[PDB]
Amino acid sequence: XVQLXXSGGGXVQXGXSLXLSCXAXXXXXXXXXXXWXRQXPGXXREXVXXXXXXXXXXXXXDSXXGRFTXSXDXXXXXXXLQXXXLXXXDXAXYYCXXXXXXXXXXXXXXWGXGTXVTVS
Amino acid sequence: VQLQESGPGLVKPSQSLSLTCSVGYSITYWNWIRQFPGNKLEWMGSINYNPSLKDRIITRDTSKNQFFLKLNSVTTEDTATYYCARGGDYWGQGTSVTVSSASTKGPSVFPLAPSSGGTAALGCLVKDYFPEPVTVSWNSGALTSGVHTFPAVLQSSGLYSLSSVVTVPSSSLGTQTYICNVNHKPSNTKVDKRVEPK
Amino acid sequence: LTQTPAIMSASPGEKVTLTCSAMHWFQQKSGTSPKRWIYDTSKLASGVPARFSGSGSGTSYSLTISSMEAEDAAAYYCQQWSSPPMLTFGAGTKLELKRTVAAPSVFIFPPSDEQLKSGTASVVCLLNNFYPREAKVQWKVDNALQSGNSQESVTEQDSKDSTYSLSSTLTLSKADYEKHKVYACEVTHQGLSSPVTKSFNRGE
Ligand SMILES: CC(=O)N[C@H]1[C@@H](OC[C@H](N)C(=O)O)O[C@H](CO[C@]2(C(=O)O)C[C@H](O)[C@@H](NC(C)=O)[C@H]([C@H](O)[C@H](O)CO)O2)[C@H](O)[C@@H]1O
Structure with missing residues (x-):
C-alpha cells in the first residue's frame, strides 16, 4: 500500500540551496528510518543520507557531509533533505526509500519516484 | 587501594571455582562482580549475596589481607570475567574464568585464498582449538596494515574458531608471498600457513 | 535499570x-x-x-x-x-x-581442500570496513536461506577509520556441502541501495 512522493527539485545555481521533501502515504513512517539516495543517468544509486527514528540520529555519505542535512516530521509523515553549498556534481535524480527493518539493516523495499536536481 | 585477583582460569563443569583477591586498606562492603561474554555486569556478593546465586556462593582472611570467592557446581553459563572491588570506587584487574569440559587441542589452520576491483582479500581460518588464546601475525609481523583478526567464536563442539583476514592490492597477488603465523601456547603449536590465490 | x-x-x-x-x-x-x-x-x-x-x-x-x-x-x-x-x-x-557512512566490502571464501579431507566445509563471508554497525548477512545455498548453521563475530571500532568488520562462517558436513552447487552470502546495509551478493560454484 505504501507510496513515497518526492518533491522540491529543480534548476539551481552553483553554491545555492534546496529543501527537498518526501511525503509518505498509506503507512506511518514514524517507526522506520528514511534514506535519501541519488542517481546520475549512466550510474547507479549511491547513498546520500539516512534519518533513523527520532533520537536515533542521522548519518551521511562522505560526498555530502557538512553540506547536507536530513530531518523528519513524524506528524506530517514526511522526510526532508536540506542541501547547502550545492555543486554541479550534485546533479542527479534524488530518490527516497524506507528501511523496512526496524533494526536499521536497511531492507529498502519501498522507493519513491525521485526528483531531478540540476546544479548549473 | 589496589586489588588483585588470582586463581585458575579453567574449571571443569560441576566442580568448584575458587578465586582469591589480595587487597592498602583494611577490611573492617567488599564485592565480587562478574561480567559475562555479553558484557552484562552482575553483583554476586559482598563480605565486610545475590538471590540469583545465594544457594552456591565468600570468606576472608586477615593475616594476608585477602578475601575469597567460592562458587560450587559451575556450568558453562558461569564463564565470565570476575572482578573484586571495594564498594564501587576501587576495582581489581579482573580474571577470566572459562568453565568447559574440553581438553587442550591445537588448531588447524586453513587458507582463505583470494580469487576473482583493485582490492583483494585473503586470510587464515584457525579452527578447532582449546583453550583461548591464539595469536596471529602476517609475514612475521611485516604486514599489519589492513589486518583484521576477529574475536573467536565458541562452536557447538566446545572448540574455538576464528579468522584473520587482510586486504591487499590485487597486483601484489603474483609478486608478494602471504604467510599467516599462528601460535597456540597451551598446546605448543606453531603454524606458518602460506595463502596462495586460486 | x-x-x-x-x-x-x-x-x-x-x-x-x-x-x-x-x-x-x-x-x-x-x-x-x-x-x-x-x-x-x-x-x-x-x-x-x-x-x-x-x-x-x-x-x-x-x-x-x-x-x-x-x-x-x-x-x-x-x-x-x-x-x-x-x-x-x-x-x-x-x-x-560517529563517522560518514561506509558500505561494507563483501568477500567470500570457499572451503579449502585440507578441511574437506576431514569431512567439514567452512564457507567464510567477510564484510570489511563498514559504518554504521547495523547490517544483515544471509546465507543462501542454491537460493535456499540458511538458518542455525552459521556463526559470526565483529571487530571493535577501528582506532583509525572508525569502521567495523564482520566475519560469518557457514559450517556444513562434506556430504551436505557436495549436495549443492551455488553458495552465496547476501549483505544488506544502510549504505547499500540493494543487497550485495557474493557467491561461488562448488565445482569451480
Ligand atoms: C568518599 C566516597 O567516595 N564516599 C562514597 C562511599 O561512602 C562509603 C561510606 N563512607 C562507608 O564506608 O560506608 O560510598 C557511598 C555509597 O554507599 C553505598 C550506597 O548506599 O550506595 C553503601 C552500600 O552499602 C553499598 N553496597 C554494597 C553492596 O557495597 C553501596 C555500593 O558500594 C555502591 O553503590 C557501589 O557503587 O554504596 C557514597 O557513594 C559515598 O559518596
Missing part, C-alpha cells in the same frame, strides 16, 4: 545525554575494569574531566557530556543500590565515534 539508547553515535563536539530509566555511573573501555565515573547522581570521580556531569532524580537519571571527545568512546553503566539489599547494574550504553 534500563539504559537509553543502547548505542549512541556522536561526532566530536556534540552534547550527549545517556538516560537511565528505573544513581551511579561507571565507564568501561574494552577489556579493562569498570571505573567509577559519576557517583551520587552528580559527583565527579577522581580524574573525570569537567565535561562530564550527572543529573536526574526519582525514576530518570542522566549522564551528560558537554562536548564529545574521542577518548570518551566507551560503555557506560548505571548502577543502583537498594536497601531488599540488592546491587543492580544496567545493560550499559555504548558511546561510539
